[PDB]
Design a protein around this ligand. Structure first.
Ligand SMILES: CCC(=O)SCCNC(=O)CCNC(=O)[C@H](O)C(C)(C)COP(=O)(O)OP(=O)(O)OC[C@H]1O[C@@H](n2cnc3c(N)ncnc32)[C@H](O)[C@@H]1OP(=O)(O)O
Ligand SMILES: Nc1ncnc2c1ncn2[C@@H]1O[C@H](COP(=O)(O)OP(=O)(O)OP(=O)(O)O)[C@@H](O)[C@H]1O
Ligand SMILES: *C(=O)CCCC[C@@H]1SC[C@@H]2NC(=O)N[C@@H]21
Ligand SMILES: [Mg+2]
Lengths: 247, 673, 261
């Protein structure tokens, strides 16, 4: 399987409007070698996807959001499921590839009473402490602290890419409009200018939060090359017996 | 192809898909700008990207996007398009469309309004053909209204009676009678269905031809009163009264009959004053007698297959005629340049009613363009989506050769080397038809699919030698995967001790039989013993490429490995058919003999939705005791309405499908006993 | 004659007053203290050394470059001090300025304090009172949070990290306390929830209030997020000093030993 194989079927997989959902497993199958994927916990906490695959013959760990289930929102079970897999992959020098499409965390009193804060912290910690090479591709939404959690560049991420359909923001364009222009009460054109200026990957691109805005048909060709140059990655961290993960 | 020829500067293609791409390509070859109209869904299709400029003309449904007169007219105004090419279907045969186009300043590339009006109705077309001294099918003139008139006509047209309603393209409004009892009861039923469909109640009664052959004469006419007949075509292979395989030169016909047919078609075209490209269809019997049957006043779907044997671009000639220039060729210039065969690759499941439309998205799509003598007309690409709104046709595959055998061999190779992953296609049926003995010999009719497969398409029935070849290929592929699994990189800390196994003893389960296979490897050559029979399989063994070419005992075979699991299951497309084989090691099978059989909850009593789309109506309710052959409900999608029969007798336990509700594929609709 | 001295004095007197005396009175009416007096209670008298006192935010969109939207300090007071003679680094979020929302300068000051603490090997104590992330800042605000998060993971197991929530905390502001070793709350004043009750009604259609959703009792009796809850700020800070007396300054130091009777 050539490492420069193109994937033109990913050019239009993401629907234009955010209401519809797609299957991240299709993207994963298209990108990886021979379209072979060993998925871990495929029937539990299905809003997140974790598994093992190969890129250019090298074992890689795949983490992604599933917009089919619960619109891809993170919750307790998905947080723990992703966190332990990420920790295992980091412990055994296995590179991580992340596909990000997440609107936020699942709201409700059940999540708050169950300790959603602790498990979201678990996932954020697992992504932050990893010293293996990690490559992140944003396919659409990345809102709020979830964007920080899903292996942002600011967590010592190596390479971050955004598809042309991506959008990184503090929160939704609407709610941002009614939270900024509260007293203006003339949001008819404010919404238009806000969506034309911020509802796109440019604010993250111009500040350097994403390395490049790539075409979806080159994703595999972009990833393998990175995994070729990050194989010798080596970082140094302060000494400790062990850290205190929010278990 | 003369750029100096001052033709229109901008042309609007008011269609979509393969015909839109073909028209755009022809216009680009002539240095003409194009305008592409599309719906919201088809915002990234092949034709919109191929053609400069694009106009969204409405939502996904065709009635509001491609049949929307106002949007198309506004697009023409905005783009200042001089001419419009309708292609086939949609507004190709609409008189009000022609009136709107001829209104302001823009020309319509096709027949004039008078010709379309004359050919629209079957009775007027038949009387015009009779005036044009063209052999017509035995039948009465006018509209039949009473059973006495129907039986009176049946007296002279014989017991075989073909009750056909006016209009209804695609096989609609057609019935068959065999007796006066059958005559009048069928005429009652035909009047009922004509009132239900359009209310015209105009029924045509004619003699039913036994074992007919559908022969189409392509005719090209200009505005200067010149008509040319470009050989013939054969479209006998049909299901649901729709053509799938077309053969350009009719092996059934000879020179004299072909000349007579062409002269009659030219005379009829002159009578109608046709000034474009069209086709005149005939039902040739076994005794080489041809009877007129309908005239299509548009570019035919299977027009490329004749092009290969004539070297003429029909779209280019149509555009030149629309400009006003006369025909550039004479009758003697038309000359047969070999043999050409065309197959329509559809997105349908051939195992269900010789084709059942299916939806999905193309994960992989590759055409055999590198193979010799292969031309592909496709309006799709990798990642394209098949939706219920449009025609599920995937592509048209055309092969040209010196003779019929070369063309058929090239077609078989192209079908074997054509990759579609994501949807279900009818390549198995096409390949099985191509290599059929009757088709190769030439004895075919309009009911070839029905009588060749009475129960239905079951797949290729592979022989003993082919079964051994398939088993050898599967075993070699399994062993190749096992060998590749052991090729790690050097560790320098814990060296890998590769096992030195010589013979692999395997149990291979195919269909229901279990075979014992002994496989050995000598580099690139696998020696496989299946039940004593010894074979040698050699190949590059590239396990990642979608297509794998192997040589079994010298014979070259192209196979595809669609699926593969660690449990031993493999799906292999071989000779165009997908076979499932379960491969285990001998010890694995011996231990598997102790495994308990899991309970399977399949005792019939349930009928899911075989086809996606919208259910028009539900004919059953809970507590209804249905019988065999009783249709549960009717579902419409992609201009086709299908009713699935229960196939068993049992009281309906519950009903989950309601009339007018969107129903996906595989959804459980009605439960019964 | 140079007006640099008068400008410096004016900037200092503005920094001490935070966002204005009226907002200080509003904060006091709620039973809450300001950041600077919280620091004064927490640390030993005459031992607080402030850092980045004149740092201001750099936003320019939505008319945030006006003089009325410029505050020295940017809703956080950061520095170092001593508890019972032992060094500690402290930051206190100022709810007076933009509701304590985190901006680029806020995150920069917190990150600088954490970097100094990890360089010298001293614990970090953080008093959290923040509405959330400044929407006017945009993605920058998010970036800042992530920076803090990264350090919260880098210092984990190296220096003790203590969080005391003394006001509302929502959105991405709830993850830094979750990454710290210990987390204390103040009754009837502090809150911790990712989404507010209004969004909960919008999505799941149920009636809950802020106290039920993210109150101190909720997180100390059924959620397992907070460790202890105190009645008010003064008692909370006294108990924080008492608790800090137990811990070592770094993981490279042995367990503290005190005079015994
Ligand atoms: C990780 C998951 C997510 O991303 S969830 C969506 C992201 N949410 C956010 O970014 C902010 C959420 N916080 C809020 O909406 C409110 O501040 C909350 C905490 C709900 C209300 O708290 P409350 O006790 O009523 O305080 P308050 O309304 O009296 O405070 C008013 C002053 O605070 C300010 N403030 C507050 N939040 C922001 C903000 N995000 N951006 C800018 N300013 C903010 C207000 O502007 C207001 O300013 P001022 O101090 O009166 O001058
Ligand atoms: N009189 C007849 N006798 C025997 N078979 C017939 C007769 N009329 C029609 N058929 C069969 O039905 C098929 C449909 O014929 P026809 O081209 O008239 O259909 P249609 O649906 O009107 O076509 P179109 O799509 O061109 O409008 C023929 O190809 C032939 O197989
Ligand atoms: C649905 O999108 C319309 C498909 C095109 C029309 C079809 S294709 C074959 C039939 N012949 C014809 O002239 N129109 C029908
Ligand atoms: Mg026809």
């Amino acid at each position: 399987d050539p490492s420069d194989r193109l994937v033109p079927e990913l050019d239009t997989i993401v629907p234009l409007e955010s209401t519809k959902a797609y299957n991240m497993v299709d993207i994963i199958h298209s990108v990886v070698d021979e379209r072979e994927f060993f998925e871990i916990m495929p029937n539990y906490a299905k809003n997140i996807i974790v598994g093992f695959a190969r890129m250019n013959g090298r074992t890689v760990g795949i983490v992604g959001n599933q917009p089919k289930v619960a619109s891809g929102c993170l919750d307790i079970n998905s947080s723990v499921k992703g966190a332990r897999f990420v920790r295992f992959c980091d412990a055994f020098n296995i590179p991580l590839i992340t596909f990000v499409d997440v609107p936020g965390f699942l709201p409700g009193t059940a999540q708050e009473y169950g300790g959603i804060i602790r498990h979201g912290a678990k996932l954020l910690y697992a992504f932050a402490e990893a010293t293996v090479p990690k490559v992140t591709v944003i396919t659409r939404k990345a809102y709020g602290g979830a964007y920080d959690v899903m292996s942002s560049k600011h967590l010592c991420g190596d390479t971050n890419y955004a598809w042309p359909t991506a959008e990184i923001a503090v929160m939704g364009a609407k709610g941002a409009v009614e939270i900024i222009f509260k007293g203006h009460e003339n949001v008819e054109a404010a919404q238009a200018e806000y969506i034309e200026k911020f509802a796109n990957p440019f604010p993250a691109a111009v500040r350097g939060f994403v390395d490049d805005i790539i075409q979806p048909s080159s994703t595999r060709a972009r990833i393998c090359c990175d995994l070729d140059v990050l194989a010798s990655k080596k970082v140094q961290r302060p000494w400790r017996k062990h850290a205190n993960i929010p278990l | 192809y003369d750029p100096n020829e001052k033709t229109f500067d901008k042309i609007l293609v008011a269609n979509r898909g393969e015909i839109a791409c073909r028209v755009i390509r022809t216009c680009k070859k002539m240095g003409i700008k194009t305008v592409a109209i599309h719906s919201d869904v088809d915002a990234s299709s092949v034709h919109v990207k191929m053609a400069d400029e694009a106009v969204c003309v409405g939502p996904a449904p065709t009635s509001k996007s491609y049949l929307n007169m106002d949007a198309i007219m506004e697009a023409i105004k905005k783009t200042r398009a001089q001419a419009v090419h309708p292609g086939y279907g949609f507004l190709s045969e609409n008189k009000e469309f022609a009136r709107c186009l001829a209104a302001e300043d823009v020309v319509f590339i096709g027949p004039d309004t008078h010709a379309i009006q004359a050919m629209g109705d079957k009775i007027e077309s038949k009387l015009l053909a009779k005036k044009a001294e063209v052999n017509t099918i035995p039948g009465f003139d006018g509209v039949v209204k009473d059973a006495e008139e129907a039986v009176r006509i049946a007296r002279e047209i014989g017991y075989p009676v073909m009750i056909k309603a006016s209009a209804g393209g695609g096989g609609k409004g057609m019935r068959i009678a065999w007796d006066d009892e059958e005559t009048r009861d069928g005429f009652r039923l035909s009047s009922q269905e004509a009132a239900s469909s359009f209310g015209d109640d105009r029924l045509l009664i004619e003699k039913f031809i036994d074992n007919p052959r559908h022969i189409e004469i392509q005719v090209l006419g200009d505005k200067h009163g010149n008509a040319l007949w470009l050989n013939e075509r054969e479209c006998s292979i049909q299901r649901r009264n729709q053509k799938v395989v077309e053969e350009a030169p009719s092996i059934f016909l000879d020179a004299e009959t072909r000349r007579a047919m062409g002269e009659q078609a030219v005379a009829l075209a002159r009578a109608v004053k046709y000034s474009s490209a069209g086709t005149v269809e005939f039902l040739v019997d076994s005794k080489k007698n041809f009877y007129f049957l309908e005239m299509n006043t548009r570019l035919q779907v299977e027009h490329p297959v004749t092009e290969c044997i004539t070297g003429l671009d029909l779209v280019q000639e149509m555009i030149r005629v629309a400009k006003g220039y006369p025909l550039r060729h004479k009758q003697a210039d038309i000359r047969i340049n070999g043999w050409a065969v065309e197959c329509r690759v559809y997105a349908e499941d051939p195992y269900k009613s010789f084709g059942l439309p299916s939806i999905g998205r193309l994960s992989q799509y590759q055409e055999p363009l590198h193979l010799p003598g292969v031309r592909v007309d496709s309006g799709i690409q990798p990642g394209s989506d098949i939706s219920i709104y449009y025609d599920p046709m995937i592509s048209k595959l055309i092969t040209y050769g010196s003779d019929r055998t070369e063309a058929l061999k090239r077609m078989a190779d192209a079908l074997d080397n054509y990759v579609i992953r994501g949807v279900t296609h009818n390549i198995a049926l096409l390949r099985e038809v191509i290599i059929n003995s009757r088709f190769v010999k030439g004895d075919i009719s309009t009911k070839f699919l029905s009588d060749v497969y009475p129960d239905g398409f079951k797949g290729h029935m592979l022989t003993k030698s082919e079964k051994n070849q398939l088993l050898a290929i599967a075993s070699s592929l399994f062993v190749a995967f096992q060998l590749r699994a052991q090729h790690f990189q050097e560790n320098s800390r814990m060296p890998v001790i590769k096992p030195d196994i010589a013979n692999w003893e395997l149990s291979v389960k195919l269909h229901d039989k279990v075979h014992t296979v002994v496989a050995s490897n000598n580099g690139s050559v696998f020696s496989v013993e299946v039940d004593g029979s010894k074979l040698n399989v050699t190949s590059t063994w590239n396990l990642a490429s979608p297509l794998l070419s192997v040589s079994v005992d010298g014979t070259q075979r192209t196979v595809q490995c669609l699926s593969r699991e660690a449990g031993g299951n493999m799906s292999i497309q071989f000779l165009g058919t997908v076979y499932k084989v379960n491969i285990l090691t001998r010890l694995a099978a011996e231990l598997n003999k102790f495994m308990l059989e899991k309970v399977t909850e399949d005792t019939s009593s349930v009928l899911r939705s075989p086809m996606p789309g919208v259910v028009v109506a539900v004919s059953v309710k809970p507590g209804d005791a249905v019988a065999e052959g009783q249709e549960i409900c009717v579902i419409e999608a992609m201009k086709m309405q299908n009713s699935m029969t229960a196939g068993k007798t049992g009281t309906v336990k519950s009903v989950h499908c309601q009339a007018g509700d969107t129903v996906g594929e595989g959804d459980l609709l009605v439960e019964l006993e | 004659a140079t007006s640099v001295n008068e400008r410096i004095e004016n900037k200092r007197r503005t920094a001490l007053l935070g966002g204005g005396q009226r907002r200080i009175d509003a904060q006091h009416k709620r039973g809450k203290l300001t950041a600077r007096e919280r620091i004064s209670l927490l640390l030993d008298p005459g031992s607080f050394v402030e850092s980045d006192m004149f740092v201001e935010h750099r936003c320019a969109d939505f008319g945030m470059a006006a003089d009325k939207n410029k505050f020295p300090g940017d809703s956080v007071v950061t520095g170092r001090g001593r508890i019972n003679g032992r060094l500690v680094y402290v930051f206190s979020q100022d709810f007076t300025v933009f509701g304590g929302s985190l901006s680029g300068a806020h995150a920069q000051k917190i990150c600088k304090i954490m970097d100094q603490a990890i360089t010298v090997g001293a614990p970090v104590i953080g008093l959290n009172d923040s509405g959330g992330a400044r929407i006017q800042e945009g993605v920058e605000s998010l970036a800042g949070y992530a920076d803090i998060f990264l350090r919260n993971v880098t210092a984990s197991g190296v220096i003790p990290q203590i969080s005391l929530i003394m006001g509302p905390c929502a959105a991405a502001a709830v993850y830094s306390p979750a990454l710290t070793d210990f987390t204390f709350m103040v009754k009837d004043t502090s809150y911790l929830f990712i989404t507010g009750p209004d969004v909960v009604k919008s999505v799941t259609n149920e009636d809950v209030t802020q106290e039920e959703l993210g109150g101190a009792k909720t997180h100390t009796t059924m959620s397992g997020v907070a460790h202890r809850a105190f009645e008010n700020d003064v008692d909370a800070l006294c108990n924080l000093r008492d608790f800090f007396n137990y811990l070592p300054l770094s993981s490279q130091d042995p367990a503290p030993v005190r005079e015994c009777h």
